[PDB]
Design a protein around this ligand. Sequence first.
Ligand SMILES: Cc1ncc(C[n+]2csc(CCOP(=O)(O)OP(=O)(O)O)c2C)c(N)n1
Ligand SMILES: Cc1ncc(C[n+]2csc(CCOP(=O)(O)OP(=O)(O)O)c2C)c(N)n1
Ligand SMILES: [Mg+2]
Ligand SMILES: [Mg+2]
Lengths: 530, 540
Amino acid sequence: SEITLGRFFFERLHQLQVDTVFGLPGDFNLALLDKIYEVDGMRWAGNANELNAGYAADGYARVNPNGLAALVSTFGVGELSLTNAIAGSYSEHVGIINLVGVPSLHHTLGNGDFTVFHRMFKNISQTSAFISDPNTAASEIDRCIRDAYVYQRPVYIGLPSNLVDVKVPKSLLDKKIDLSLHPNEPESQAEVVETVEKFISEASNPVILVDACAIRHNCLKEVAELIAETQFPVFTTPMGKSSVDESNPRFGGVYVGSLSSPDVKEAVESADLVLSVGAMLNVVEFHSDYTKIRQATFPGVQMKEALQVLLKTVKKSVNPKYVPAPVPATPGNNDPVSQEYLWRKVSDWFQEGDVIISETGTSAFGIVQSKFPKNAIGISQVLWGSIGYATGATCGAAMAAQEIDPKKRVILFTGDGSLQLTVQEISTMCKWDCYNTYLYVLNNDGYTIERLIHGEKAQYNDIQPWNNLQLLPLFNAKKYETKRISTVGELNDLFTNKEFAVPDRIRMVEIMLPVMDAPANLVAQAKQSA
Amino acid sequence: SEITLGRFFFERLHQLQVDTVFGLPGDFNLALLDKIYEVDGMRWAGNANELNAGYAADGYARVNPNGLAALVSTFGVGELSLTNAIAGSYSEHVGIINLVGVPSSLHHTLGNGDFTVFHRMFKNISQTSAFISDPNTAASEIDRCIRDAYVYQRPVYIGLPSNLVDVKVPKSLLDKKIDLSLHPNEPESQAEVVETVEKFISEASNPVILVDACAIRHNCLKEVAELIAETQFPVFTTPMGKSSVDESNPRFGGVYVGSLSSPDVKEAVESADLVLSVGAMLTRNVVEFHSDYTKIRQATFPGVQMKEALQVLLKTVKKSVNPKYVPAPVPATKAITPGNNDPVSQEYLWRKVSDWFQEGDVIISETGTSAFGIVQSKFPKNAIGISQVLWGSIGYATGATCGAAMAAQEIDPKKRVILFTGDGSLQLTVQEISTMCKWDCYNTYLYVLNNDGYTIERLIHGEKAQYNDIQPWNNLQLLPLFNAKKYETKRISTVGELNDLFTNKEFAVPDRIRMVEIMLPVMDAPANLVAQAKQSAATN
Ligand SMILES: Cc1ncc(C[n+]2csc(CCOP(=O)(O)OP(=O)(O)O)c2C)c(N)n1
Ligand SMILES: Cc1ncc(C[n+]2csc(CCOP(=O)(O)OP(=O)(O)O)c2C)c(N)n1
Ligand SMILES: [Mg+2]
Ligand SMILES: [Mg+2]
């Protein structure tokens, strides 16, 4: 009793709750896409373009419980349009199953080299498979999907059209893909734990610092237990924001070196012990595949198991003399709305489980100062920093949220400029009735973050003004609402509006801001960049 | 008296009449972009995204008299977004000067410390590269890369570190123009080619000329016209070469597409005892002039470049024609007249637009029904045809229209730039209409064929499959949403409306940016695409 390899692929996605598939059809993937419809619960997004599909997949993966998403593109024209999306997924460790339909000409570089596109993707892929052999095809799909999950990174699967309809035992699906990690080397683990507990013993002012890899490698429960057991002040990076429940009274804010609110700079940098969890690269750093303790590297000591074993005894290794350290902590209605006011005030509007997406620009710098609710999912592409990403990701994040909980809201802060690069993916949001979605657009008449560092008045920092609020109706939103916010009063009213808080329609809000207005932290970097 | 290397770069573009520069600013190109403004006549497009910038550059290059365009992007996030644009430019031989601003010689990195990773990826879709380091050779390298782009009519990758932008250089360097000229052909090889070709023209009863796109890229259109004049042989183009030959020429027999040709064309070409092919991109009595070499039957003559070869052939080719040869009759356009109130069709549209075109029209057709349709349409004298037949990346046409329109603005305000894009393809690159509105591209006509999704795909596989659906857009709202200063929109549903649109005297004048939505049945297609669809099912 048999299934097509094509169907096998989508069945594996369904098993890992990857129930939305991003990308676009083309000459060499049509036979494969036919198979999504054979798998109960699965939908093809039908993206507005490939780059946006890739951005969507990235957004989806950051909400998907297993941290996975799937892309299907066509040979050459499809894959190369997604290049920058996969690069960013690699950069920030996002588990993308990037499948490309390839031939058994047209969409060629004029030569006869059919691997040229596969070779380009090796630099931004954890692993590849240009699948040929029918006998190993199922195993290879499984192997690639495992690597994506384990290393939390993109993988390239080239599937020739001829191998889509090749028959395979249905029984293969009865054995789940092996997602488990090898156990840590016992002696290396023991040494790490012994040494870490020893330094916690001798510390007077220890702090916990959580970065993004703590999220990717599923250590958020472990991190919460570590805060519980030690009662140490805890902080995140901007890339790691939402790793820690910011409701926790021990949470001290977001560490950004010299760009931190001075209280954060002092609390972190005055510490005699830093317990770093999942840094992206007297200090302890737990990483995915090793542990650093000062200038010593312990190769192979994986962070999840190490933390789990640490938590069994960590409380009783705390200095007996240690006291839980204290942690860091009004305009007119018709005053124009400011960056400073907006990022403070949005804290009051967020709710448990909000997906909160911030584009590179004033938005990403601003949201740092904002306070997230319990079980917030933060998305900010701080490392790769490709503008446009946030709008594509919002599409994927919204479709993932739809599959988890209809009550779960997905909130975007994009600039006017970044919106332009990836605007057509709002189409896809409207196609799938993403009534969970809030598109906040900051209109400051161009590229304000760039104006601050270089070329304040230069024409390259200009953008064509758009009637942005006409976008949702142009893309035929079935049920939608639009608002323009110019004042503190309008913003306050919007954030206490009971109807607006309910995710029952797709919304866009345009917030009018001065050309050169910026959050305090970005004003600081601008001044020291000079 | 000295200039920055940054300014030098833009001065060289000005000298090659590349007066528009496409792409977007980023962390590692701001100091460089400052220099565009120091070079009188030059403008920064400020594109809506990098892929579209790349598509625009491609469109610009296909109108620019030297066949060149310039891109500026930022390290990582900028360049990788343009990858598919540069691949297509490489595929179809378009001369893109793809410059990328890079860090000084840990943000927009793959997390490692490998700063060449993006340069190495672009080598596969670049004729040549320069990751410029040395101040002493920097000017020379820019020059070398720009020459290769022109000579090989292909993209070139220039990585310019931020620190080298403001490095001073003699102004006098600009007094030595970049050498664009080709080495003369080896005289003996050329003589052998010409002697052999003239010998086979002597012995031929029914010879034909077939012109492909490389005849355009390597500036042989005058030579091709003289060859038609001198031989009076029937001449045809490929779809990729359409507009290489003036379709007004009475010796022009139409567009050869193998089995997908109107049967008259199939017979006229395939009955020939001699094919004089000019600039093929790649019966048995065949001569192919290529950029690099000449093929005569089973023999390759390496190094015999096509322009000079043709020029030397034209001096004596007329006197090698059989004296008894009678100019062969050419395919006549075979009549199809529906009623005013009949719904508009693909067949009617592609016949009827022939009557609306005018001397010098830039006519751009997207992959889909449009590209297949425009083949059957008749172009005017000095038409510039743009159809990405080889690479075939949907979205391209809308980006290219932006670049084609800005190039047209620099040549002649009266020169119209006309786009046929599908409803589906439009979605992929829609935001570049913004750039058209920003620069008052009042030369631009955006024809959108609304057939409720991906019709060319529906024809080959998955007629009713959900992947061939697209979200319906209120497409005609696009120009006002992007704040077109002066614009006009029309929806065409009927033969009557289309006829009226094409005799409308105001609409013909390029004094405003226009979009026309043409409503067509889901499965309507031009005859030639209906043919390929049916035999693509035979090959499956
Ligand atoms: C793909 C890409 N192209 C270019 C850049 C460079 N870049 C960084 S910020 C920015 C402008 C962002 O402007 P906007 O989104 O309006 O934000 P704000 O004005 O609020 O700062 C640009 C062009 C980039 N990061 N990614
Ligand atoms: C970048 C890219 N993605 C996908 C494709 C595959 N593709 C080829 S034609 C087509 C549909 C185009 O439909 P439309 O523009 O509506 O034209 P129609 O045939 O309906 O007139 C698609 C998706 C491609 N060639 N390039
Ligand atoms: Mg802005
Ligand atoms: Mg269509």
